[PDB]
Amino acid sequence: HHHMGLNTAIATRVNGTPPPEVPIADIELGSLDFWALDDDVRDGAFATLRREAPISFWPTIELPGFVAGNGHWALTKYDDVFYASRHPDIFSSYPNITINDQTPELAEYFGSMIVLDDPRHQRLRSIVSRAFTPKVVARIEAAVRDRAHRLVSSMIANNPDRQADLVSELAGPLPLQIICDMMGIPKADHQRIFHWTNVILGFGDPDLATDFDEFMQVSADIGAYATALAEDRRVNHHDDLTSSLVEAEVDGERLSSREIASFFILLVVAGNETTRNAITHGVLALSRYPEQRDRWWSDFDGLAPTAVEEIVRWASPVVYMRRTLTQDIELRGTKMAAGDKVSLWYCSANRDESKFADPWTFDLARNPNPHLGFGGGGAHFCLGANLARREIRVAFDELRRQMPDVVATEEPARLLSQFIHGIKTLPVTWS
Ligand code: HEM
Ligand SMILES: CCOC(=O)CCCCCCn1ccnc1
Numbered sequence: 001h002h003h004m005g006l007n008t009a010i011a012t013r014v015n016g017t018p019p020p021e022v023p024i025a026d027i028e029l030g031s032l033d034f035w036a037l038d039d040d041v042r043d044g045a046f047a048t049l050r051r052e053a054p055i056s057f058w059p060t061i062e063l064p065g066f067v068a069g070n071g072h073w074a075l076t077k078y079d080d081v082f083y084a085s086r087h088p089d090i091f092s093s094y095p096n097i098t099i100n101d102q103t104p105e106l107a108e109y110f111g112s113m114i115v116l117d118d119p120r121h122q123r124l125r126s127i128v129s130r131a132f133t134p135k136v137v138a139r140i141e142a143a144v145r146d147r148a149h150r151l152v153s154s155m156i157a158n159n160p161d162r163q164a165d166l167v168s169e170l171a172g173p174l175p176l177q178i179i180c181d182m183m184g185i186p187k188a189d190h191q192r193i194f195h196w197t198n199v200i201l202g203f204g205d206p207d208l209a210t211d212f213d214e215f216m217q218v219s220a221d222i223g224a225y226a227t228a229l230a231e232d233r234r235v236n237h238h239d240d241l242t243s244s245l246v247e248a249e250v251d252g253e254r255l256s257s258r259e260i261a262s263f264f265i266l267l268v269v270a271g272n273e274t275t276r277n278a279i280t281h282g283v284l285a286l287s288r289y290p291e292q293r294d295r296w297w298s299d300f301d302g303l304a305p306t307a308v309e310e311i312v313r314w315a316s317p318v319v320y321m322r323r324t325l326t327q328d329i330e331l332r333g334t335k336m337a338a339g340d341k342v343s344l345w346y347c348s349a350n351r352d353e354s355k356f357a358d359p360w361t362f363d364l365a366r367n368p369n370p371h372l373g374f375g376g377g378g379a380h381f382c383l384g385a386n387l388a389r390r391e392i393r394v395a396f397d398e399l400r401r402q403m404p405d406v407v408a409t410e411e412p413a414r415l416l417s418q419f420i421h422g423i424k425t426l427p428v429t430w431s
């Protein structure tokens with residue numbers, strides 16, 4: 001009740017404290033109710049699974065209008081998630097990378113390279129890979145700085161009472177601007193794009209959408225938007241990713257309408273529904289662990305590489321990805337069959353004591369940090385990892401410089417999702 005800092009700040013936590021493990025009878029990964037439990041309970045549940053049932057089978061959650069279908073084998077240990085990620089010939093990304101079943105209706109919009117194996121996957125990725133390389137992403141530092149600086153200044157100018165929502169006022173709009181400008185989308189449409197991607201990756205949370213007809217209308221609307229922009233760029237090139245997409249050939253053929261729409265959707269969804277959560281979880285963590293804030297603030301450039309990676313490990317913005325077996329395998333005495341679904345729990349790998357001796361410590365100097373927040377490595381390693389790391393670093397530097405004592409004042413409103421570790425709103429203040 002008499003803590004350092006601003007009076008309405010949330011409670012701090014003792015760094016390093018492991019959450020209690022949860023009795024296995026209380027764990028139901030196949031119920032959306034489990035995904036509504038407190039993150040301490042979730043974290044303690046995956047701790048139980050790592051200890052007691054490191055590979056275990058679960059029914060698939062059926063969100064309204066999706067097809068659940070067959071259940072899945074959950075890999076909760078780091079070493080199994082890594083192995084699966086590095087064996088794509090066994091653990092295929094086709095037909096889907098979420099646990100539910102693909103359909104033709106969905107594949108119009110969600111049939112991108114993320115649900116394909118090589119060689120076609122790599123031929124698609126090579127259309128855009130150069131734009132996401134470290135040395136190319138570095139050359140847009142000025143754009144990231146301009147927008148992040150302006151957003152933080154606007155939080156100050158727009159809120160005389162010194163209260164704001166970090167998500168809507170910084171964490172959301174920064175990555176949105178950057179990916180949309182890369183794509184070649186005009187500013188006037190960025191908020192439309194953001195509403196569409198919020199629904200696409202928020203489905204099942206009543207605050208976002210629970211009517212499948214709304215999900216499909218949004219998907220059709222963003223697909224139509226992509227097609228129309230692509231059509232413009234076919235006739236008049238711009239130096240943007242949409243133009244690259246429409247100019248490319250794979251195996252001697254231009255991409256179809258479905259392929260262009262799916263590629264465009266993949267890139268904007270992934271740009272808009274990930275980094276914002278790393279930033280927001282990171283501010284939550286700094287609020288809980290002020291010693292970590294202080295050490296980063298007093299050596300920002302020196303600690304930034306490791307600090308950003310620790311924020312990603314801590315947040316695990318992508319909770320899991322799915323694979324499908326192409327052959328029978330056995331792991332940990334559990335035999336899994338060709339055709340079975342396998343879920344890779346990055347959130348759990350990133351707390352595995354076998355790989356991190358002190359996994360419950362939020363340590364901005366952590367080195368090494370072999371976290372799987374961008375996946376286990378290999379063919380599908382996050383295309384956006386360099387971009388995301390730069391966005392995160394700049395956002396925190398701009399906060400440090402202009403409102404160093406920014407702190408959460410309420411616990412987050414958490415997205416109801418099995419797939420994305422999302423924060424919908426995070427009230428903050430500053431002096
Ligand atoms: C902190 C932010 C992010 C996290 C934690 C994240 C995480 C991931 C993960 C876990 C995967 C799957 C990797 C695998 O299967 O091995 C992935 C793939 C991907 N990510 Fe990200 N991502 C982030 C930001 C971004 C950004 C900014 C973009 C830019 C558009 C992006 C685009 C993609 C794409 C296109 C793929 C599919 C790559 C492929 O199939 O080859 N992501 N990401
Ligand atoms: C299911 C509907 O959305 C999609 O299929 C398209 C987006 C998939 C993105 C996967 C998650 N992610 C975010 C950032 N990097 C990876």
Ligand SMILES: [Cl-]
Binds near residue numbers: 018047
């Ligand atoms: Cl533990």
Ligand SMILES: [Cl-]
Binds near residue numbers: 015289290291292
């Ligand atoms: Cl600490």
Ligand SMILES: [Mg+2]
Binds near residue numbers: 163164165
């Ligand atoms: Mg407000």
Ligand SMILES: [Mg+2]
Binds near residue numbers: 181
């Ligand atoms: Mg532009």
